[PDB]
Design an enzyme around this catalytic site. Structure first.
Site, mmCIF file in Angstrom:
data_model
loop_
_atom_site.group_PDB
_atom_site.id
_atom_site.type_symbol
_atom_site.label_atom_id
_atom_site.label_comp_id
_atom_site.label_asym_id
_atom_site.label_seq_id
_atom_site.Cartn_x
_atom_site.Cartn_y
_atom_site.Cartn_z
ATOM 1 N N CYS B 163 48.601 30.534 8.204
ATOM 2 C CA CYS B 163 47.480 31.469 8.164
ATOM 3 C C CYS B 163 46.567 31.325 6.961
ATOM 4 O O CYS B 163 45.703 32.166 6.723
ATOM 5 C CB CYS B 163 48.011 32.898 8.259
ATOM 6 S SG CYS B 163 48.951 33.155 9.776
ATOM 7 N N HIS B 298 43.793 39.891 3.446
ATOM 8 C CA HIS B 298 44.496 39.141 4.466
ATOM 9 C C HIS B 298 44.905 40.161 5.522
ATOM 10 O O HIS B 298 44.822 39.883 6.721
ATOM 11 C CB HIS B 298 45.724 38.471 3.849
ATOM 12 C CG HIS B 298 46.631 37.825 4.847
ATOM 13 N ND1 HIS B 298 46.252 36.735 5.602
ATOM 14 C CD2 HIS B 298 47.903 38.112 5.214
ATOM 15 C CE1 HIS B 298 47.252 36.379 6.390
ATOM 16 N NE2 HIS B 298 48.266 37.199 6.174
ATOM 17 N N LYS B 328 40.407 41.996 10.114
ATOM 18 C CA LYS B 328 41.316 41.631 11.198
ATOM 19 C C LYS B 328 41.542 42.823 12.117
ATOM 20 O O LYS B 328 41.924 42.657 13.274
ATOM 21 C CB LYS B 328 42.658 41.118 10.657
ATOM 22 C CG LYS B 328 42.646 39.635 10.258
ATOM 23 C CD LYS B 328 44.053 39.117 9.991
ATOM 24 C CE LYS B 328 44.036 37.701 9.428
ATOM 25 N NZ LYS B 328 43.476 37.641 8.052
ATOM 26 N N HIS B 333 44.057 38.273 14.534
ATOM 27 C CA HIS B 333 44.518 37.235 13.617
ATOM 28 C C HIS B 333 44.331 35.855 14.250
ATOM 29 O O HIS B 333 45.086 35.475 15.145
ATOM 30 C CB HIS B 333 45.996 37.450 13.302
ATOM 31 C CG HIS B 333 46.465 36.732 12.076
ATOM 32 N ND1 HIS B 333 45.784 35.663 11.535
ATOM 33 C CD2 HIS B 333 47.541 36.938 11.281
ATOM 34 C CE1 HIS B 333 46.419 35.245 10.454
ATOM 35 N NE2 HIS B 333 47.489 36.002 10.278
ATOM 36 N N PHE B 390 46.932 34.317 3.296
ATOM 37 C CA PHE B 390 48.329 34.005 3.020
ATOM 38 C C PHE B 390 48.984 33.506 4.300
ATOM 39 O O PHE B 390 48.551 33.857 5.396
ATOM 40 C CB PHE B 390 49.055 35.254 2.511
ATOM 41 C CG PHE B 390 48.338 35.962 1.390
ATOM 42 C CD1 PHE B 390 47.859 35.255 0.292
ATOM 43 C CD2 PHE B 390 48.151 37.342 1.428
ATOM 44 C CE1 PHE B 390 47.204 35.909 -0.756
ATOM 45 C CE2 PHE B 390 47.498 38.008 0.385
ATOM 46 C CZ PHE B 390 47.023 37.287 -0.710
ATOM 47 N N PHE B 392 52.862 31.827 6.314
ATOM 48 C CA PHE B 392 54.309 31.654 6.306
ATOM 49 C C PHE B 392 54.612 30.464 5.412
ATOM 50 O O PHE B 392 53.824 29.521 5.349
ATOM 51 C CB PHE B 392 54.824 31.381 7.724
ATOM 52 C CG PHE B 392 54.739 32.570 8.651
ATOM 53 C CD1 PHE B 392 55.024 32.425 10.009
ATOM 54 C CD2 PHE B 392 54.394 33.832 8.171
ATOM 55 C CE1 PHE B 392 54.969 33.518 10.877
ATOM 56 C CE2 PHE B 392 54.335 34.935 9.030
ATOM 57 C CZ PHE B 392 54.623 34.776 10.389
#
Ligand SMILES: *C(=O)CCCCCCC
Ligand SMILES: *C(=O)CCCCCCC
Ligand SMILES: [N+]
Ligand SMILES: [N+]
Lengths: 406, 406
Positions: B163, B298, B328, B333, B390, B392
């Site tokens: 992301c 984010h 968002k 997303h 940000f 994973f």
């Protein structure tokens, strides 16, 4: 004007699971290609591959390997090797914002992408999918699955550029050192080996299919009867470190990355233009006034590709043609992992003074006439070496590495 | 060290097929989430998504689109918009070594990876797969499928970091200008929308599942009743250009990228540590002599996630928190495309003097108190804006953009 050097390396390949085994294979011109019942059972024409001979079960903490796909696993093991080879203790590279990681893969994880869709369409649905498919299948799996367990606090992401992937990763790491943003960046990549992805190449005729009865003869770069590359899997990782930082801790230095080229063809999607490779190598040679003693070609053993690159090399060096050998004739094409794995083969040749043979050339393609393509292991003092990486989409990368004095 | 400014942008989003449609949606606080029969049919619990409302048929040349997956298509259309909006013509950006492309996606193309496996396992085998799966499924599809038809000759690769993908591409494009390697770099990315990929997020309980009846309300960042993000698809592209080069051609300059942060948590695979976000933001603010007027968080509308970032923000600004908004909440997303799309939303806000609303906050989370979260479209004269991305693997990217000042 910061200098970037390689102080550690790690590798998991079809021809070796550490630098010592790889060294021996290279010196012996030993093939890492075998017959694959899996590829044959999938219904493919190509039944040969460069597989990793290693049951990785239990080599990684369960709490860690649960999020990983093969590409991430291969890179992980490679990194453990490089850390030890570089002599970096945990406190030396962990929780340190000046230490980053740039590594990726060419296809992420087709296997787990397909596993998820298959599981989802089954009687269990979501329950069958499980909560570990995203980290395994995402394109950045290789960097995400390594940066986290290794406590990396610096840069963390993956560069992906098909068959140039790991080369660009190393180059970008060099850039981080040059921008003074990082003191150390583990660079490299990995790639899984599966029919899921392989059949896609076979479906576009990119894989070898006429030498399934003789697996070790299938990959034959420059040979007049080559018929496509032999897909492979594996991983690699090198420690790119700023020179002063390396010297200060008394690190062993393999060589300095004195040149990095990265260009684009802007021509065809799956075939090279050559024009782009010429600029790529020239860019990598800017300010490099020592002769290129050895060139580890991209040479994947494909009809068009092999000679296209030889033509670009001619344009760049002219009557100054360097020694050339295509190690893929031995290892197969590890795609996204080829870049770092081939930089390692080049670094080993540089470190131990020898040129690995370009095998299986029973009849040299006439377009390769007049070039110094080494077909027999040759001992020689090398100082500067070049390694090419080109991938679909007309993406080009070239790394030039050179020994430092004393 | 040279300066990089953004001189053009393009976008295909759930809230707009171009910057005009996107502008209209943002000020209106319009939502782009819809009910998805596809997700429901696949057997998922999440039945909502931020889809692209556009019939792309015939928008891309037949011989060009045949190699593309949706992620590539969205990015391609975004690039066409960026090119026109930048005032550039073929003569200036094509076949030019000084112009490159850095754009990627988060998952490549799970849909075509699954299509390849499904087809291969069928009775037609290789014939059913076709010769165009590799370029659609490979992680570097987004950069490969654009650099080739657009005739780019400079850099050409994809940065992928979940992301944070398209945010890193932009920062990396900036690094090319700072290093003096490129005069222009088209940066951004795209991401497809499909149950093939979405079901992987549902399987780990990351997607909203309680508001399938009221789609436009499922995505509600900072709302005490949030229950996971709403997956979306789309693309984005900005033209990162060297300052003098842009001024010399009388280019329109949205803003200058005065800050770029890239760090790593080195903690959890799917959860943020916060410590990493802090370093990332401060890194992007280093040297910036102006305060942050607005911050496009984010904020994905997840329980832990939303609050972790806020905590990091308090840690960075203390009592001087900037106006905050989570777009968002209305867009969804777009994973890999989020970085560039949100960089674009920020540029539009900075360009049209206003702060889009953070919608669906029926009840502000208590851990959100003390901060300046805007829930209404507000007219204000911004100068310096910040966008966080940000992903994973603990990968952090932060971009700070500011009105031009020589
Ligand atoms: C090398 O450029 C051939 C394409 C490899 C892409 C990665 C595997 C999907
Ligand atoms: C964002 O970091 C969540 C993971 C996105 C991966 C996209 C490909 C599956
Ligand atoms: N190479
Ligand atoms: N953002």
């Amino acid at each position: 004007m910061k200098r970037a050097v390689i102080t550690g390396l790690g590798i998991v390949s079809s021809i070796g699971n550490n630098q010592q085994e790889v060294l021996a294979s290279l010196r012996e011109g030993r093939s890492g290609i075998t017959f694959s019942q899996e590829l044959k059972d999938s219904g493919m024409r190509s039944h040969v591959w460069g597989n990793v001979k290693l049951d990785t079960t239990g080599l990684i903490d369960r709490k860690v390997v649960r999020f990983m796909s093969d590409a991430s696993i291969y890179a992980f093991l490679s990194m453990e090797q490089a850390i030890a080879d570089a002599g970096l203790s945990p406190e030396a590279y962990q929780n340190n914002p000046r230490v980053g990681l740039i590594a990726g893969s060419g296809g992420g994880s087709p296997r787990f992408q397909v596993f998820g869709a298959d599981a989802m369409r089954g009687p269990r649905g979501l329950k069958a999918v499980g909560p570990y498919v995203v980290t395994k299948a995402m394109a950045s799996g290789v960097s995400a699955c390594l940066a986290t367990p290794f406590k990396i606090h610096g840069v963390n992401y993956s560069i992906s550029s098909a068959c140039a992937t790991s080369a660009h990763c190393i180059g970008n790491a060099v850039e981080q050192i040059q921008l003074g943003k990082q003191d150390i960046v583990f660079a490299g990549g990995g790639e899984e080996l599966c029919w899921e992805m392989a059949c896609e190449f076979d479906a576009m005729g990119a894989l070898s299919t006429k030498y399934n009865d003789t697996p070790e003869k299938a990959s034959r770069t420059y040979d007049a009867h080559r018929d496509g590359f032999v897909i492979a899997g594996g991983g690699g990782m090198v420690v790119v470190e700023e020179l002063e930082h390396a010297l200060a801790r008394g690190a062993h230095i393999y060589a300095e990355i004195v040149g990095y080229g990265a260009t684009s063809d802007g021509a065809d999607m799956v075939a090279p233009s050559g024009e782009g490779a010429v600029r790529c190598m020239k860019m990598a040679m800017h300010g490099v006034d020592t002769p290129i003693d050895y060139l580890n070609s991209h040479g994947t053993s494909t009809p068009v590709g092999d000679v296209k690159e030889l033509a670009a090399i001619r344009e760049v060096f002219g009557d100054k043609s360097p020694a050339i050998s295509a190690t893929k004739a031995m290892t197969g094409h590890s795609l996204g992992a080829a870049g770092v794995q081939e930089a390692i083969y080049s670094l080993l040749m540089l470190e131990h003074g020898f040129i690995a043979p370009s095998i299986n050339i029973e009849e040299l393609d006439e377009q390769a006439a007049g070039l110094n393509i080494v077909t027999e292991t040759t001992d020689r003092e090398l100082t500067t070496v070049m390694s090419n990486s080109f991938g679909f989409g007309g993406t080009n990368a070239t790394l030039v590495m050179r020994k430092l004095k004393d």
